[PDB]
Amino acid sequence: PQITLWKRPLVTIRIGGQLKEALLDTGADDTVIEEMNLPGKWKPKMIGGIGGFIKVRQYDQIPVEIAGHKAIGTVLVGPTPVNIIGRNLLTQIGATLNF
Amino acid sequence: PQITLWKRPLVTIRIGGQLKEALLDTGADDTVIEEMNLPGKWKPKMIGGIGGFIKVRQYDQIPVEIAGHKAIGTVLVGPTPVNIIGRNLLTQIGATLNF
Ligand SMILES: CC(C)CCN(C[C@@H](O)[C@@H]1Cc2ccc(cc2)OCCCC(=O)N[C@@H](C(C)C)C(=O)N1)S(=O)(=O)c1ccccc1
């Protein structure tokens, strides 16, 4: 599809068997999902943005379906105000910026 | 042009007559530039991100050239980790997300 940017680019994703609304974010290196009980092992880590850093749990090889497109990769879970789909997963669904 | 996301989408911009590097960020509502002197009046404002809120200087109707494309709009100046071109200017150059 072609998504314009008049509004935040929010789409439906499926992760851990749940459907969520997430932002397609070309400015995010990683994918950050709002707090949820994903099973599996994880490693702690800190990611930073405008305002400072937050602590998150890093989960590897998690399957995520983005608007019907299947992907699988690292997902960081923590207290983010919004679900963010980063470049690590966008590259997998062949997303590009065009102008 | 068509930009893929295996690397951060960094491009050269011209603002205040100066050249700088900025991230094309579909996840940013606004454009936030690192501290610098920009002619004209400005208003105090606060914006939030992953790690909380920061105080910025709001500059209105500033001409910014993004990879040869012209835009004129609001630019926020403050302590950001990187120069960010947000949706307010991306829509002016006709940027879209495609996949
Ligand atoms: C950009 C750089 C520093 C960091 C990469 N990050 C992606 C950006 O697009 C972030 C993502 C984001 C965060 C919070 C949100 C909405 C979106 O709710 C607030 C809405 C206001 C807004 O639009 N805030 C922008 C601001 C630049 C004007 C912002 O901070 N946007 S990030 O901090 O969230 C990260 C960092 C590391 C790993 C994943 C995500």
Swiss-Prot record, chains A, B:
Residues 20-89 form the Peptidase A2 domain. It comes from the Viruses. Residues 1-5, 49-55, 88-99 are annotated as: Dimerization of protease. This is Protease. Homodimer, whose active site consists of two apposed aspartic acid residues. Aspartyl protease that mediates proteolytic cleavages of Gag and Gag-Pol polyproteins during or shortly after the release of the virion from the plasma membrane. Cleavages take place as an ordered, step-wise cascade to yield mature proteins. This process is called maturation. Displays maximal activity during the budding process just prior to particle release from the cell. Also cleaves Nef and Vif, probably concomitantly with viral structural proteins on maturation of virus particles. Hydrolyzes host EIF4GI and PABP1 in order to shut off the capped cellular mRNA translation. The active site is at 25 (for protease activity).
